[PDB]
């Protein structure tokens, strides 16, 4: 026992020690990014021991170590919940962050605020492991708002640029609309259950839990970019590449999904919450994957990829399979962080070129980047026995064989095909064909930082699904009996997506010029949703914030 | 429309700008290079069909429905260059573009860290302040009554003088600090 | 309380007998010593308030407002000493004397055992504040605010005076300790309805209430920095303190007289926060933010649950510190660019990185980032108003979107983007200014460690 | 430590180490390394500190409040006695709050300690929690922010009138 | 023309005549000692010793006592078979209800 | 033929598809030349103060000062209470207050009626 | 990464583009060859040359400057202005 809780707290204190180092500085640093990367490597090594001794016995515990407040019946203590979710998320998050920082020591080398960048990225990591280890709603709200604010500060990293500040304020807006529902859930549990602690919520086990679960679904909508509150995740590609790699693909954006996986004993006894999660997840995984088909910025395409995977996570929560959703989080982190890292390696090699229509011929120019991008795309689509096979296919193997919304299943399959479509679209326009980038080739990737940082997540994207899924215990019963047209569903739909998009890509070499269709104009302008509501809802606010609020009432009449 | 020197766009400028925007939006439509180059010569032929049109009212109408053609056939997200406005790297380093006068607010312990730089900056500022009144009295006798008509400035006429309104154009920050 | 009133009065011979170059240093030193002395008021008990004499007492409501009041004087002396450098020495000592006299009035306003001594000190605090605002306000254009001060005197403090004299004749006393045990229920009658309005409307204007907030984005604008600091930090909170004392006598009629004014605040924080999205004046934006935060304190006092009083006094302390720091940041740019226009000086993180760090921290406390006591007060008020009505969470949460929206906008406009070209007098940050920001922020951050001392008498 | 009756812990049942595979686990080696490198120096420093605790043994005490007369037997508007009654009532209010907090700590620790069988094996703690929350709600809910012993007595009297009327209407 | 008026005084810079100015005063010795007073009696005195004072407050509003007292009373009434809390705060025998 | 672009409040018509941009008349030459003249004169008046070394401060912009004085000061003294101002100050002034008043009063009367009839699940509700 | 541009490099690259253009002969092309008057090109050809410069160097020349660049030396001078060469 004395090993588990000790190294659990040592991981978090070790992550906080470079924040004290960067705040207690007088000299100019002897490579402070290397210091933070070494610290997070050792924090990974430290958190490996509680994970291994959890896989040995199933040892979960709670560390309610510091009494903080007592509001008359509510003892808010500093309480860390070490369960299956923390024991599988903390090594994956530390491993991904360690690869992102060895990536950033190459990519962000020209930035004179590199110490501020690594400081902010460590602050994000601290707030995120506050989020995923919290035992009450208040400490989880601390980590929740912390990853929201570090999202603000890392989107608006180039703070002189107007679009970065605009996207950062946009992300804060949609996350606070999710925070309306999170505070609704906290309010409901405090009034009806007298607690913010998870244990008393789970032990009391309320039955009229539609309203707190609607609050939690609105919170996951604001946080995991579900439909209605989605466009900030494509807008948030205006930040740097390791920001979009770590935060907005693999670590922050799974926290609404993690919030709903965390409250699984309430969702497993509320069919209405499961149905709403299933419908919203299927809507998001349709819409964002459809928008990804007709984009040309590679960071936008991989952001729509990760939001479609978040919608699929919401789907597999909505079929009452939360542990498969969390296995898909731990799986998805590796190859999606690696896809953003390889895309940004292309971007930095091609002198800040992000548009895929000026790329190509990079199969033999950037060989390691091409190899890892193909491996990440095939792990995304569901190639057999890569890491993305060990969760996502099982998701389909439980989405077919369950009492399910049928249209949600059909849109889930259309999303599964669209994943293959935009993956081979990225490989077509960025790796295949003949070059389209300008004439002064500065293409290079031979830094051990970049190569080792993509290499360790490559080892993850090859072996981690097998290793984790053979190291996690059963928490449901895997539905393993189905007809052969139903077992071969996800693979056949994925290969049909590959065939359809290869025919689409080979219609582009033809010497014909067609007028744009309405489907192309719809999917290219993002379902017309960021074009209308980003103009209309500010307008109807701000005129109402000036004409009647300031001028008419609160300067003349009142 | 809105320009610093001219108050309008000439018809020749309108034709060239519409040709350029048509080719750029076409290259956005027509990703591959040989395919775009084929359609680019086809579109060059379409623009050179009515290059020799003498009637400016008929050329005005042809330009107007050419704008309608370009608007009907435009790409929704055309290729913007990264440091072009609307690009992904546009105005990215503007947070690093510190104005030069902030060097005047440094402490002398860090001004002494770069002695040759500030020792030369003193005579740069000396040059500016003995150029200023000469270029003001240059501009006050050349500007017509009612103020200047166009925003363009005259150059340095005498030998030894400097061109007027020059300090912020010369001492502007680098585009990659 | 007489170990605090007498040093505050000895700051008058300290400020008038000091040498001409020493009058800021001496008053700052001895007011910091009084603020260190002010922690002896933390001898509170779970059953009994700390009752010093027949004239003065201190429960856990008055104690943090006293500590904040005695802490606010050195910060005002730091903030107001730059723009009084070319002032006459005697006028400078008159300024310091009016600040000391305002602290003297406040620290025996919050400890007033009896309610008409509370009224005398409560309406005594307006006069040095009035003289500070109108003698050192750098411009005075108050054509509409005179009629509003007449409306404050008519609808506010005078019915409170007549009502307190009526309670003095009826109950026989206005000791709050006696009124804890001799309180009669105030039933439904028209006499008791005008009684409720007389007991409440003075403190409604002092909070301020929405619709009655017309004075506050004028009096904050036309004031010096010390006046705006003491208005945002303490002088709004006299209304909340007086409501939490006077709602003892107003039961149970409050349970149906609160319903209009609660609406006036629950919609009102939706409006004024939205008003902050269209402010050209930064100081007016911070003023409307103060209205948008004191609306929650009005609701939390009127719904009179324990969680609402805990959240309301935590929000009062937290918003005092936060909005005082916001006005000090607004002045730290106004002393350079000489205009309050928020779109004038932009991109200031390129020029002042540590000051932009202070802007970031004050914005994050302004938008209630947990675990700060802004969020603790905000959150407990939201929980209690959910217990009041489950729909109000919408009007809470929507406010908690817009409260974020103008908080970062104030950060994005002033500190981010491209710097303004034609402004070249942007000096580096003086150590005085950074010390002022830290003496605001570091107590506000340390109170997140131990918030139980700012949660009122029924923690 | 503490009192094992107010904080009950059922007798722990750990299974024996049963090594089936020939590969040596890392956890025994890391446990021995933690026992040598970490447990021993911390334990030696704690023994030094405890010797220094023994070199000056001095004590503190739990304050006792003898029961003064309550609000029922205090005269109306007699502040000298009903002040004592109010102080007694407020001390009992805060102590009842901490009793509720103790029962909540029991319920949460039972749920975690039983793990997945928490619904089957924590019926008694949930029953005690339901009884103590019903008692605390009948005793102190809906008083308001200006609560007192008079408000609590009037709520008790209204509840007793309701219980007497419910007893009367049943016969 | 308009009256005899002194012109607008320009805003002085405290860094020109004193590049080590902290902004407290224009006299440098007065400025540095104002800085030392603000930093010592603000940070070294009020914040540090104040947090040390607040951290070791002797059971602020008797919370800890009230837990330990509860740890007595539960132990008194778990053992004697009593319920943990009565539904009546006062004794229902010493209460006279209005009859009807 | 082609779909004509529809302008909107939040979707303005382009400069290219507006017909009055293609005016060639001499009065449009006069208007464009006077706009270029005013813009050039204001540009010169700006950057003589901007490029001045003897000035170290803020080039004050009286259009900006005039904008802030219009957004703050000119609101009351150019008010006239008429039908339009009174009806619009009664719609958005006492409208949503009455709306949320009746909504919250209705829900609280419903909740009070359910509590005094023993209906509302107030089981574990001891924080309030 | 991001190699420094020189007037020799900008000159040689602009002339390297114009020597791969089938309306400009590589023997009459100089550094001061005017497009309309000396090389005999159209304004359409001049717009294609400035767009080829945009394709070459990876940024955009605006139209108010693209309508006036009438020699390769003006192109080299404009890229020298927009890239800050010979530090
Ligand atoms: C009683 C003893 C207690 C001891 C422990 C201390 C407890 C807290 C004390 C105060 C903590 C903050 C102090 C620093 C901030 C203010 C100054 C500043 O900006 O310095 C920048 C500077 C470093 O920057 P730089 O590059 O040198 O120059 C500035 C740059 O130009 C430009 O700057 P920049 O943009 O590059 O970087 C600014 C960056 C910007 O970063 C951010 O804005 C990110 C912050 C938000 C997201 C992350 C946090 C989310 C919440 C989770 C963490 C809290 C809970 C954790 C607990 C477990 C989970 C529940 O800010 C930071 O890095 C600050 C780190 C700490 C942030 C705390 C949260 C602030 C957010 C708003 C309130 C949130 C809720 C309340 C939190 C209360 C915590 C107790 O720091 C220093 O030089 C340090 C000065 C000395 C600090 C002393 C601190 C103690 C003071 C108290 C004295 C009395 C007690 C004695 C203790 C003495 C200990 C030594
Ligand atoms: C390098 C730094 C380390 C220090 C090196 C030098 C010292 C060597 C190491 C030994 C240290 C001394 C012995 C151990 C410490 C003392 C232990 C002890 O009993 O301390 C008393 C107590 C323990 O609590 P407690 O339960 O005894 O009492 C609480 C107080 N009452 C009852 C009044 C409410 O305090 C601490 O331990 C303080 C440290 C806490 C650590 C975490 C701080 C986080 C702060 C976050 C602020 C916001 C919170 C928001 C979230 C809240 C929850 C949702
Ligand atoms: C704020 C807006 C209302 C202010 C009203 C004026 C101050 C009233 C202070 C309370 C006085 C009081 O005891 O009222 C009950 C007393 C009741 O009279 P009484 O208390 O003498 O009667 C004996 C007791 N009963 C009622 C049982 C018979 O009210 C009044 O006498 C009149 C109250 C209204 C005052 C009208 C003039 C001012 C109008 C508003 C101006 C602003
Ligand atoms: C108060 C009303 C007026 C308001 C304005 C006041 C202005 C004047 C200021 C006067 C002085 C200050 C007064 C308030 C002081 C409040 C602080 C205080 O006393 O705290 C007591 C608290 C008391 O904690 P406690 O409640 O556990 O105390 C237990 C009681 N004793 C000590 C007796 C056993 O002190 C601490 O918590 C200190 C613990 C050790 C130091 C902290 C360790 C962890 C810190 C964080 C580490 C990094 C985390 C990750 C960060 C990531 C990046 C963000
Ligand atoms: C996983 C198993 C992959 C192999 C089995 C499926 C084979 C298949 O049907 O491939 C379809 C298609 C090849 O056929 P086609 O492209 O039309 O013809 C040209 C041939 N080079 O296209 C391909 O083979 C390319 C897509 C393969 C997808 C692999 C990942 C799933
Ligand atoms: C303007 C500035 C910005 C806004 C700030 C606030 C200004 C207004 C302050 C007062 C707000 C409205 C008055 C308070 C409403 C409380 C409930 C109420 O009075 O309901 C209306 C009443 C219903 O009748 P009822 O309450 O039963 O009357 C018998 C009482 N024993 O209906 C009636 O009895 C009919 C109407 C009778 C006239 C009442 C006049 C006195 C109240 C206003 C003063």
* DSSP secondary structure of A413-444: HHHHHHHHHHHHHHIIIIISSS--S-SS----
Which of C154, C260, C302 is the pocket-test mutation for ligand 6 (most atoms within 8 Å of CB)? C260
Of F36, F41, F43, the CB nearest to B7: F36
Q: Which residues of chain E make contact with B107, given a CB cutoff of 8 A?
A: 19-20
* Residue located nearest, by CA, to atom 15 of ligand 2: A66
How far apart CA E21 and CA E18 sit, in angstroms, is 5
E-strand stretches of F17-123: none
How far apart CA C358 and CA C232 sit, in angstroms, is 18
Q: Is the distance from the beta carbon of residue E71 to the nearest atom of ligand 2 less than 6 Å? A: no
CA angle D59, D63, D65 (to 5 degrees): 160
Q: Which residues of chain G make contact with A347, given a CB cutoff of 8 A?
A: none
> CB of C285 within 8 A of CB of C410?
yes
Q: Which of C379, C371, C368 is nearest to C403 (CA)?
A: C368
Pairing between β-strand A74-82 and β-strand C57-58 as defined by DSSP bridges: unpaired
CB contact under 8 A, B81 and G54: yes
The alpha carbon dihedral of C187, C188, C189, C190 has a sign of positive
Q: Which value, to the nearest 10 degrees, does the dihedral of the CA atoms of residues A465, A467, A471, A477 take?
A: 40
Reduced to 3 states, what is the DSSP secondary structure of residue G7? helix
Phi and psi angles of residue A134, each rounded to the nearest 5 degrees, phi first? -75, 140
> CB of A454 within 8 A of CB of A338?
yes
Per CB distance under 8 Å, which residues of F are interface residues toward A?
Answer: 9-10, 75-76, 79, 85, 88-89, 92-93, 121, 123-128
> Please, how many CA atoms are within 13 Å of residue A517, restricted to the half-sphere of its CB?
4
Maximal CA-CA distance, chain A? 76
> Which structure tokens are listed for A8?
């659990």
Residue located via tokens 């969680």: C307
> CB of B88 within 8 A of CB of A236?
no
> CB of A206 within 8 A of CB of F121?
no
Question: Chain-centre distance of CA A455, in angstroms?
Answer: 21
Q: Which residues of chain B make contact with E20, given a CB cutoff of 8 A?
A: 107
Phi and psi angles of residue A68, each rounded to the nearest 5 degrees, phi first? -110, -45
- List chains adjacent to chain A, taking adjacency as at least 3 C-beta pairs closer than 8 Å: B, C, D, F, G
> Please, how many CA atoms are within 13 Å of residue E50, restricted to the half-sphere of its CB?
27
Q: Which of C107, C100, C72 is nearest to C2 (CA)?
A: C107
The bound ligand whose nearest atom lies closest to the alpha carbon of A79 is 2
How far apart CA F80 and CA F89 sit, in angstroms, is 12
Residue of D nearest to A4 (CA): D31
> CB of A272 within 8 A of CB of A210?
yes
Of B91, B96, B101, the CB nearest to C424: B101
> CB of A190 within 8 A of CB of A74?
yes
- DSSP single-letter state for residue C422: T
Ligand 1 pocket, Cβ-based, cut-off 6 angstroms:
A 23, 116, 123, 127, 130, 139, 142, 146, 149-150; C 353-354, 357, 360-361, 364-365, 369-372, 442, 445-446, 448-449; E 47-48, 51
Alpha carbon of A108: minimum distance to chain G alpha carbons (Å): 12
Scan residues 335-394 of A and list those with Cβ closer than 8 Å to G: 348, 351, 353
Residue located via tokens 């300790």: C177
The alpha carbon dihedral of A509, A515, A517, A521 has a sign of positive
Q: After which residues is chain F broken (C to N over 2.5 A)?
A: none
The alpha carbon dihedral of A183, A188, A189, A194 has a sign of positive
Which atom of ligand 4 has the smallest separation from the CA of E52? 19
Experimental approach: cryo-EM
- Catalytic, G42? Answer yes
Q: Which residues of chain A make contact with F88, given a CB cutoff of 8 A?
A: 548, 552
Q: After which residues is chain D broken (C to N over 2.5 A)?
A: none
CA angle D4, D6, D8 (to 5 degrees): 50
Q: Which spans in A292-321 are helix H?
A: 298-318
> Which structure tokens are listed for A327?
């296995």
Scan residues 422-451 of C and list those with Cβ closer than 8 Å to B: 424, 426-428
> CB of C71 within 8 A of CB of C8?
no
> Which structure tokens are listed for C376?
């603790």
Pairing between β-strand C50-51 and β-strand C57-58 as defined by DSSP bridges: antiparallel
Scan residues 97-126 of B and list those with Cβ closer than 8 Å to C: 97-99, 101-102, 105
Interface test with F, best of B65, B72, B134, B147 (most F CBs within 10 A): B147
Q: How many residues does chain A have?
A: 558
> Which structure tokens are listed for A204?
């009391």
How far apart CA C102 and CA E84 sit, in angstroms, is 52
Q: Which of C251, A9, B133 is nearest to D143 (CA)?
A: C251
Count of C-beta atoms within a 10 Å radius of residue E74: 24
Q: How many domains does chain G have?
A: 1
Count of C-beta atoms within a 10 Å radius of residue B171: 14
C194 CA from centroid of ligand 3 (Å): 6
Domain housing G21? 1-87
CB contact under 8 A, E26 and C453: no
Q: Is the distance from the beta carbon of residue A377 to the nearest atom of ligand 2 less than 6 Å? A: no
CB contact under 8 A, B105 and C427: yes
The alpha carbon dihedral of A522, A528, A530, A535 has a sign of positive
Q: Which of G25, G42, G65, G81 is catalytic?
A: G42
How far apart CA A100 and CA A117 sit, in angstroms, is 12
Residue of A nearest to B26 (CA): A513
Reduced to 3 states, what is the DSSP secondary structure of residue C190? helix
- List chains adjacent to chain E, taking adjacency as at least 3 C-beta pairs closer than 8 Å: B, C, D
The alpha carbon dihedral of C168, C171, C176, C178 has a sign of positive
CB contact under 8 A, B102 and C347: no
Per CB distance under 8 Å, which residues of C are interface residues toward D?
Answer: 46-48, 177-178, 180-182, 247-248, 251, 304-306, 308-309, 458
Q: Which of A328, A291, A294 is nearest to A310 (CA)?
A: A328
Instruction: Please name the residues in contact with E24: beta carbons below 8 A apart, sequence gap of 6 or more.
Output: C24, C78, C81, C430, C431, C432, E30, E31, E34, E35, E38
Residue located via tokens 């005793």: D139
Question: Chain-centre distance of CA B57, in angstroms?
Answer: 30
What H or E segment, with its residue span, contains residue A81? strand A74-82
Which atom of ligand 1 has the smallest separation from the CA of E50? 94
The bound ligand whose nearest atom lies closest to the alpha carbon of A127 is 1
How far apart CA A416 and CA A244 sit, in angstroms, is 23
Q: Is the distance from the beta carbon of residue A424 to the nearest atom of ligand 5 less than 6 Å? A: no
Number of H helices, E strands in chain B: 6, 0
Q: How many CB pairs under 8 A join B and C?
A: 21
A66 - beta bridge partners? Answer: A78
Which of C150, C193, C194 is the pocket-test mutation for ligand 3 (most atoms within 8 Å of CB)? C194
- Cα G18 to Cα A281, A350, B121, C246: the distances in Å are 55, 24, 41, 88
Taking the Cβ of residue D87 and every Cβ of chain C, the question of whether any pair is shorter than 8 Å is answered with yes
Maximal CA-CA distance, chain D? 83
> Which structure tokens are listed for A468?
């984790």
CB contact under 8 A, C350 and B168: no
> Which structure tokens are listed for A538?
């500010």
> CB of C70 within 8 A of CB of C36?
no
Q: Which residues of chain C make contact with A541, given a CB cutoff of 8 A?
A: 274, 277
Q: Which long-range contacts (CB under 8 A, 24 or more apart) does D1-5 make?
A: D2/E71, D3/E71, D3/E75, D5/E75, D5/E78, D5/E79
How far apart CA A339 and CA A454 sit, in angstroms, is 9
Count of C-beta atoms within a 10 Å radius of residue A295: 22
A65 CA from centroid of ligand 2 (Å): 8
Count of C-beta atoms within a 10 Å radius of residue C379: 26
> Please, how many CA atoms are within 13 Å of residue D118, restricted to the half-sphere of its CB?
20
Q: Is the distance from the beta carbon of residue E56 to the nearest atom of ligand 4 less than 6 Å? A: yes
Q: Which value, to the nearest 10 degrees, does the dihedral of the CA atoms of residues A209, A214, A215, A220 take?
A: 130
> CB of E8 within 8 A of CB of F60?
no
Instruction: Please name the residues in contact with D87: beta carbons below 8 A apart, sequence gap of 6 or more.
Output: C47, C48, D68
CB contact under 8 A, B105 and E19: no
* Residue located nearest, by CA, to atom 34 of ligand 6: C190
What H or E segment, with its residue span, contains residue A65? strand A61-71
Reduced to 3 states, what is the DSSP secondary structure of residue C43? coil
Of B72, B75, B95, the CB nearest to A160: B95
Q: Which residues of chain F make contact with C264, given a CB cutoff of 8 A?
A: 97
C423 - beta bridge partners? Answer: F58
Pairing between β-strand A74-82 and β-strand A61-71 as defined by DSSP bridges: antiparallel
A502 CA from centroid of ligand 5 (Å): 9
Domain housing C397? 1-459
How far apart CA A21 and CA A36 sit, in angstroms, is 10
> CB of C211 within 8 A of CB of C161?
no
- Cα C236 to Cα B151, C125, C206, C240, C297: the distances in Å are 53, 11, 6, 7, 11
* Residue located nearest, by CA, to atom 10 of ligand 6: C260
Maximal CA-CA distance, chain C? 68
Estimate the crossing angle of helix A137-155 against helix A162-193, to 10 degrees. 170
Residue located via tokens 């204007």: C205
* Residue located nearest, by CA, to atom 17 of ligand 5: A499
- Cα F124 to Cα A192, A208, C154, C395, E83: the distances in Å are 6, 13, 47, 25, 18
């Amino acid at each position: 026992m004395n090993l588990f809780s000790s190294l659990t707290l040592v991981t978090l204190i070790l992550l906080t020690m470079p924040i004290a180092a960067i705040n207690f500085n007088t000299h100019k640093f002897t490579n402070y990014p290397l210091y933070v990367k070494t610290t997070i490597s050792c924090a990974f090594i430290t958190s490996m021991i509680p994970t291994m001794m959890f896989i040995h016995t199933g040892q979960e515990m709670i560390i309610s170590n510091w009494h903080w407040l007592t509001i008359q019946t509510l003892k808010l203590s500093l309480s860390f919940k070490m369960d299956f979710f923390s024991m599988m998320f903390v090594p994956v998050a530390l491993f991904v962050t360690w690869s992102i920082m060895e990536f950033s020591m190459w990519y962000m080398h020209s930035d004179p605020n590199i110490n501020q960048f690594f400081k902010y990225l460590l602050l994000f990591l601290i707030t995120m492991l506050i989020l995923v280890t919290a035992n009450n709603l208040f400490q989880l709200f601390i980590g929740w708002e912390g990853v929201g604010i570090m999202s603000f500060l890392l989107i608006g990293w180039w703070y002189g640029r107007t679009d970065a500040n605009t996207a950062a304020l946009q992300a804060i807006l949609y996350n606070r609309i999710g925070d309306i529902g999170f505070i609704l859930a906290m309010a409901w549990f405090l009034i009806n259950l007298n607690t913010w602690d998870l244990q008393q919520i789970f032990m009391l086990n309320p039955n009229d839990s539609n309203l707190p679960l609607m609050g939690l679904i609105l919170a996951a909508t604001g946080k995991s970019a579900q439909f209605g509150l989605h466009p900030w995740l494509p807008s948030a590609m205006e930040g740097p590449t390791p920001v979009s790699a770590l935060l907005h693909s693999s670590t922050m954006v799974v926290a609404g999904i993690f919030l709903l996986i965390r409250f699984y004993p309430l969702t497993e006894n509320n069919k209405f919450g499961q149905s709403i999660m299933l419908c919203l997840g299927a809507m998001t995984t349709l819409f964002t994957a459809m928008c990804a088909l007709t984009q040309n910025d590679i960071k936008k395409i991989i952001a729509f990829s990760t939001s479609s995977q978040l919608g699929l996570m919401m789907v597999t929560i909505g079929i009452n399979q939360p542990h498969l959703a969390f296995l898909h989080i731990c799986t998805h982190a590796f190859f999606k962080a690696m896809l953003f890292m390889c895309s940004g390696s292309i971007i930095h090699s091609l002198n800040d070129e992000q548009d895929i229509r000026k790329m190509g011929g990079l199969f033999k120019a950037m060989p390691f980047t091409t190899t890892a991008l193909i491996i990440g795309s095939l792990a995304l689509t569901g190639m057999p026995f890569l890491t993305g096979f060990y969760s996502k296919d099982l998701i389909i193997e439980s989405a077919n064989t369950s009492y399910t919304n049928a249209w949600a299943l059909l849109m889930t399959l259309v999303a599964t095909s669209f994943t293959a479509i935009y993956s081979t679209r990225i490989i077509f326009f960025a790796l295949l064909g003949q070059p389209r980038f300008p004439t002064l080739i500065n293409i290079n990737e031979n830094n051990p930082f970049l190569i080792n940082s993509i290499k360790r997540l490559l080892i993850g994207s090859l072996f981690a699904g097998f290793i984790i899924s053979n190291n996690i215990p059963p928490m449901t019963i895997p539905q393993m009996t189905m007809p052969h047209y139903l077992k071969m569903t996800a693979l056949t739909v994925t290969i049909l997506g590959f065939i359809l998009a290869l025919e689409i890509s080979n219609t582009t070499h033809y010497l014909k010029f067609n007028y744009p269709s309405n489907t192309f104009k719809f999917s290219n302008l993002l379902g017309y949703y960021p074009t209308i509501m980003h103009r209309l809802t500010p307008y109807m606010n701000l005129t109402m914030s000036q004409k009647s609020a300031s001028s008419l009432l609160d300067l003349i009449w009142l | 429309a809105f320009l610093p020197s001219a108050a309008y766009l000439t018809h020749q400028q309108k034709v060239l700008q519409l040709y350029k925007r048509a080719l750029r939006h076409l290259e956005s439509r027509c990703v591959h290079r040989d395919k775009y180059r084929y359609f680019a010569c086809l579109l060059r032929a379409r623009f050179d069909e009515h290059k020799n049109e003498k009637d400016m009212v008929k050329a005005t109408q042809l330009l107007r429905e050419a704008e309608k053609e370009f608007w009907h056939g435009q790409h929704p997200q055309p290729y913007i260059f990264p440091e072009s406005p609307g690009g992904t790297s546009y105005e990215r380093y503007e947070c690093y573009k510190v104005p030069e006068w902030c060097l005047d607010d440094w402490h002398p312990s860090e001004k002494a860290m770069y002695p040759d730089y500030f020792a030369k900056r003193e005579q740069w500022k000396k040059l500016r302040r003995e150029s200023w009144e000469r270029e003001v009295k240059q501009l006050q006798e050349e500007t017509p009554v009612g103020g200047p008509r166009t925003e363009a400035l005259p150059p340095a006429r005498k030998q030894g003088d400097l061109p007027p309104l020059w300090w912020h154009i010369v001492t502007r920050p680098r585009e990659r600090p | 309380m007489l170990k605090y009133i007498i040093p505050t009065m000895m700051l008058m011979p300290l400020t008038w007998l000091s040498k001409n170059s020493m009058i800021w240093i001496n008053t700052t030193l001895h007011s910091l010593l009084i603020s260190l002395t002010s922690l002896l008021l933390l001898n509170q008990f779970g059953d009994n308030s700390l009752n010093f004499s027949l004239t003065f007492f201190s429960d856990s409501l008055s104690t943090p407002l006293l500590i904040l009041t005695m802490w606010l004087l050195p910060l005002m002396l730091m903030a107001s000493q730059h723009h009084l450098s070319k002032e006459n020495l005697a006028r400078k000592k008159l300024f310091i004397s009016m600040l000391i006299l305002l602290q003297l009035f406040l620290i025996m306003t919050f400890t007033a055992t009896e309610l008409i001594f509370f009224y005398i000190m409560f309406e005594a605090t307006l006069v040095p504040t009035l003289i500070i605002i109108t003698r050192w306000g750098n411009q005075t254009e108050r054509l509409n605010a005179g009629l509003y001060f007449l409306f404050y005197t008519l609808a506010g403090s005078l019915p409170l005076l007549v009502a307190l004299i009526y309670i003095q004749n009826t109950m026989g006393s206005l000791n709050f300790l006696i009124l804890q045990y001799w309180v009669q229920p105030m039933p439904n009658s028209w006499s008791n309805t005008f009684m409720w309005l007389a007991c409440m409307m003075a403190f409604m204007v002092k909070m301020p209430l929405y619709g009655l907030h017309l004075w506050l984005p004028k009096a904050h604008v036309e004031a010096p920095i010390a006046g705006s600091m003491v208005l945002a930090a303490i002088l709004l909170k006299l209304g909340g303190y007086g409501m939490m004392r006077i709602t003892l006598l107003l039961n149970p009629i409050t349970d149906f007289m609160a319903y209009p004014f609660i609406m006036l605040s629950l919609w009102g924080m939706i409006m004024t926060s939205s008003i902050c999205l269209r402010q050209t004046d930064l100081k007016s934006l911070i003023a409307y933010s103060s209205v948008s935060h004191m609306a929650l304190v009005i609701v939390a006092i009127l719904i009179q649950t324990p969680w609402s009083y805990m959240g309301a006094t935590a929000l009062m302390i937290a918003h005092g510190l936060t909005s005082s720091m916001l006005f000090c940041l607004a002045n730290s740019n106004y002393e350079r660019v000489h205009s309050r226009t928020m779109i004038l000086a932009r991109g200031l993180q390129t020029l002042l990185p540590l000051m932009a760090a202070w802007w970031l921290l004050a914005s994050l406390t302004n938008l209630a980032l947990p675990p700060s006591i802004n969020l603790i007060g905000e959150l407990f008020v939201v929980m209690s108003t959910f217990s009041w009505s489950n729909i109000t969470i919408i009007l809470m949460g929507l406010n908690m979107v817009i409260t974020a929206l103008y908080s970062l906008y104030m950060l994005i406009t002033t500190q981010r983007g491209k710097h303004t070209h034609h402004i070249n007098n942007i000096l580096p940050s003086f150590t005085r200014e950074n010390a002022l920001m830290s003496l605001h922020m570091l107590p506000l951050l340390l109170l997140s460690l131990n918030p139980k001392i700012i949660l009122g008498p029924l923690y | 430590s503490w009192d094992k009756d107010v904080y009950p812990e059922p007798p722990r049942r750990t299974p024996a180490p049963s090594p089936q595979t020939s590969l040596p686990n890392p956890i025994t080696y890391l446990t021995k390394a933690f026992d040598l490198l970490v447990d021993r120096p911390v334990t030696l420093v704690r023994e030094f500190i405890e010797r220094q605790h023994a070199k000056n043994k001095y004590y503190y005490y739990h304050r006792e409040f003898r029961r003064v007369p309550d609000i029922t037997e205090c005269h109306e508007k007699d502040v000298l006695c009903m002040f004592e009654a109010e102080m007694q009532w407020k001390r009992d209010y805060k102590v009842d709050q901490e009793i509720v907090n103790i029962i909540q700590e029991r319920l949460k620790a039972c749920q975690q300690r039983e793990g997945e069988s928490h619904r089957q094996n924590c019926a008694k703690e949930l029953q005690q929690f339901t009884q103590v929350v019903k008692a605390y709600q009948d005793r102190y809910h809906d008083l308001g922010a200006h609560y007192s012993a008079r408000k609590c007595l009037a709520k008790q009297k209204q509840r007793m009138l309701a219980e007497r009327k419910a007893t009367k209407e049943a016969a | 023309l308009r009256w005899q008026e002194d012109p607008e005084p320009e805003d002085e810079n405290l860094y020109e005549k004193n590049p080590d100015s902290h902004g407290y005063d224009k006299d440098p010795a007065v400025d540095v000692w104002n800085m030392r007073v603000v930093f010592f009696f603000g940070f070294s005195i009020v914040l540090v010793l104040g947090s040390t004072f607040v951290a070791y407050l002797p059971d602020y509003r008797m919370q800890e006592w009230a837990r330990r007292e509860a740890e007595r009373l539960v132990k008194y009434r778990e053992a004697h078979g009593l319920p943990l809390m009565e539904s009546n705060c006062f004794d229902p025998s010493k209460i006279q209800l209005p009859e009807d | 033929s082609f779909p004509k672009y529809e302008p909107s409040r939040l979707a303005s018509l382009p400069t290219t598809l507006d017909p009055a941009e293609y005016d060639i008349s001499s009065e449009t030459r006069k208007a464009q030349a006077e706009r270029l003249a005013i813009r050039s004169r204001l540009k010169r008046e700006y950057q003589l103060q901007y490029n001045d070394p003897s000035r170290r401060g803020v080039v004050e912009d009286p259009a900006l000062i005039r904008w802030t004085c219009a957004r703050s000061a000119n609101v009351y003294p150019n008010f006239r209470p008429n039908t339009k101002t009174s009806l619009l100050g009664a719609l958005f002034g006492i409208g949503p207050l009455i709306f949320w008043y009746y909504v919250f009063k209705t829900d609280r009367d419903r909740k009070e009626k359910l509590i005094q009839e023993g209906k509302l699940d107030r089981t574990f509700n001891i924080s309030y | 990464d991001a190699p420094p541009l020189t007037l020799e490099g900008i000159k040689d690259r602009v002339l390297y583009v114009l020597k791969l253009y089938d309306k400009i002969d590589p023997e009459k092309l100089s550094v001061n060859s005017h497009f309309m008057k000396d090389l005999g090109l159209d304004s359409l050809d001049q717009v294609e040359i400035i767009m080829a410069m945009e394709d070459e160097f990876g940024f955009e020349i605006p139209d108010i400057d693209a309508e006036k660049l009438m020699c390769p030396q003006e192109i080299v001078d404009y890229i020298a202005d927009k890239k800050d060469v010979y530090e």
